[PDB]
């Protein structure tokens, strides 16, 4: 029976770290990431931003980031002029890039598939473009970009993401206002980035989620939103992004919990099934992953929530306004909606737990047998 409880722990470790659809742990990690991505999708469009490379006022700089959830648009336009970036002001281009890099990694990797928690070496390619226009816009220039000839230049660097080496290609292309194809009859510069080999693992995407929500909180720019004529309303319609203190806290807390959940994965790996220690460490780990998963579910669950934050979840974050679109998907109508499968993931997380009851008792059983043995 000591050995039956070990086959049981082996079996349930596999259900937790090898499986996905039916892993509480997996769904909890997904829910934390999607909640973060969903947050930006909801408010990104309402956020002001502009300035030059050094976060100063610019009087002419318009900088546009593609595959971003903007107002009636697949780009976010950072074109606020004459006031310097800062707290309760426009987000700076420095910050917006940090946020945009993270957003692009998350949407591409979610699009591709988060692997199971044990699967830890997977990678993904991420490509993303932004433009600069306006005399005085240094946001696409050598200084900010690394590329010698702004006019067609291309640099290949290595950078490190989650302690892994990522080969980055940057290229720069000016499109003259006279150019055949340029309808916006304004000169602009287009910067493409390709990140070859980005980590696509539960852990890494959680760091990206972390950087996303925490670049927002810290930069704390001004926003103003527009309500739809029907359906849930957001009031007040104007303020500072870090003023969403409850949403941000909960999202922070689910990322932390999911991170704590990933650490328990190695304890399990380090003790596949005197040995009593390992049995205990493995069993306790499994119990902790289930405790943290239920907790991630409870945090964002509409039945535990109340006015205002409840409203933000049920009416905005857990929805998609895209027209009727897989996980990574940005349209002219993503804005003011999460479009990150938050309704569905909350569901699946709570269901994987419903269907994890026998495993919860087998894990609990082995906990005692193991603890007993240890003493």
């Amino acid at each position: 029976a000591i050995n039956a409880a070990r086959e049981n722990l082996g079996a349930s470790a596999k259900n937790l770290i090898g499986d996905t659809k039916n892993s509480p742990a997996y769904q909890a990690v997904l829910l934390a990431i999607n909640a973060a991505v969903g947050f930006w999708n909801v408010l990104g469009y309402a956020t002001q931003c502009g300035g030059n490379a050094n976060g100063q006022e610019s009087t002419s700089s318009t900088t546009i980031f593609n595959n971003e959830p903007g107002y009636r648009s697949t780009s976010i336009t950072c074109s606020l002029n004459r006031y310097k970036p800062g707290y309760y002001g426009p987000m700076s281009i420095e910050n917006f890039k940090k946020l945009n890099e993270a957003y692009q990694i998350l949407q591409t990797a979610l699009n591709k598939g988060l692997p199971a928690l044990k699967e830890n070496n997977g990678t993904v390619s991420v490509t993303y473009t932004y433009t600069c226009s306006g005399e005085g816009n240094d946001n696409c220039s050598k200084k900010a970009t690394g590329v010698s000839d702004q006019n067609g230049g291309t640099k290949t660097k290595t950078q490190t993401i989650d302690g892994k080496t990522v080969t980055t290609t940057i290229s720069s292309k000016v499109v003259d206002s006279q150019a055949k194809g340029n309808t916006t009859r304004v000169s602009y510069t287009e910067i493409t980035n390709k990140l070859d080999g980005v980590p696509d693992s539960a852990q890494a995407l959680l760091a990206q989620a972390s950087t996303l929500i925490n670049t927002i909180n810290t930069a704390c720019p001004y926003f103003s939103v527009t309500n739809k004529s029907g359906g849930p309303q957001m009031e007040p319609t104007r303020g500072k992004l870090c003023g969403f203190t409850e949403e941000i806290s909960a999202i922070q807390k689910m990322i932390t919990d999911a991170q704590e959940l990933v650490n328990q994965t190695s304890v399990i790996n380090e003790h596949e099934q005197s040995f009593a220690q390992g049995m205990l460490a493995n069993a306790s780990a499994q119990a902790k992953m289930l405790n943290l998963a239920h907790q991630v579910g409870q945090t964002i669950n509409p039945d535990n929530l109340t006015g205002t934050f409840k409203n933000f979840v049920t009416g905005f974050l857990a929805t998609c306004n895209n027209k009727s679109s897989p996980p990574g998907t940005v349209t002219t109508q993503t804005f003011a909606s999460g479009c990150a499968y938050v309704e569905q993931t909350i569901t699946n997380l709570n269901n994987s737990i419903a269907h994890f009851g026998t495993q919860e008792q087998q894990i609990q059983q082995a906990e005692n047998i193991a603890d007993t043995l240890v003493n």
Partner: nanobody
Framework: QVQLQESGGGLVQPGGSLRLSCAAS????????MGWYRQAPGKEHELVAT???????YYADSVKGRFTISRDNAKNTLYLQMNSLKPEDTAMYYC?????????????????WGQGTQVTV
């Protein structure tokens, strides 16, 4: 978040007229007012005229009487009819707008701007 693009600038005779245009796009819901600045190569920039969501207009003494501000809400377009032009009107005219961040501030300057269009009289 808002983008503004002017047109209609050109060469004009003293006495004549021009209508300037501005196509606005983006977060138009967030604007509390729109308007026109100008700057001559030598001079300071000058606020020419404004129009504030109630259809309430301001004009600089210097253009008051000669120039009309006006919008077409349906096509998201801002106009500036300029009559009886004098050579002292030669300048870059900029389309501009004020976001709702500027609500309580009466003398803040517009936080969105076009790339300007040239009017030489």
């Amino acid at each position: 978040q808002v983008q503004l693009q002017e047109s209609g600038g050109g060469l004009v005779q003293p006495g004549g007229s021009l209508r300037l245009s501005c196509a606005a796009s983006g977060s138009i819901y967030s604007l509390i007012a729109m308007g026109w600045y100008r700057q001559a190569p030598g001079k300071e920039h000058e606020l020419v005229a404004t129009i504030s969501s109630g259809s309430t207009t301001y004009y600089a003494d210097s253009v008051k009487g000669r120039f009309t501000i006006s919008r077409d809400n349906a096509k998201n377009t801002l106009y500036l009819q300029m009559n009886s032009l004098k050579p002292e009107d030669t300048a870059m005219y900029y389309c501009a707008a004020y976001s709702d961040r500027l609500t309580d501030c009466s003398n803040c300057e517009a936080d969105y701007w076009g790339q300007g269009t040239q009017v030489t009289v």
